[PDB]
Amino acid sequence: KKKITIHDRKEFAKFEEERARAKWDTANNPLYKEATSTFTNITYRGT
């Protein structure tokens, strides 16, 4: 329990270069049902 999650940190960085382009939904979506996929220790430091 100290890497298995980080391993999925780069799978996302590529999964975007995979489908490339982008994707999003709004306006016709009254309830802003957004989300937040934060990775352990974001860019900024903390510990």
Binding site: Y32, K33, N41
Partner: protein, 95 residues
């Protein structure tokens, strides 16, 4: 993971004000490895922002424009933590 050892609390998760940065805190890095996933619901926009703290905690916050009852869902490693979703309405301007 440890959706149970998840930390959750703040003056914004109980309620907040319309057009006022709703703050809060959800710590769970010590619980064990795991990715963070949450569903921010609300009848208005919502700008998330991660601010650091003197203790290095993780207090995230967001502003809202619609005055009334809004709601932010909560999930850890994609696991709705007990007492979910978290109901969080926006009060009226402090006054």
């Amino acid at each position: 993971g440890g959706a149970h050892k998840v930390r959750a609390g703040g003056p914004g998760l109980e309620r907040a004000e319309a057009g006022v940065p709703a703050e809060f805190s959800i710590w769970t890095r010590e619980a064990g490895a795991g990715g963070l996933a949450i569903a921010v619901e609300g009848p208005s926009k919502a700008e998330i922002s991660f601010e650091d703290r003197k203790d290095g905690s993780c207090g995230v916050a967001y502003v809202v424009q619609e005055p009334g009852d809004y709601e932010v869902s909560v999930k850890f490693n994609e696991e709705h933590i007990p007492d979910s979703p978290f109901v969080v309405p926006v009060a009226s301007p402090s006054g």
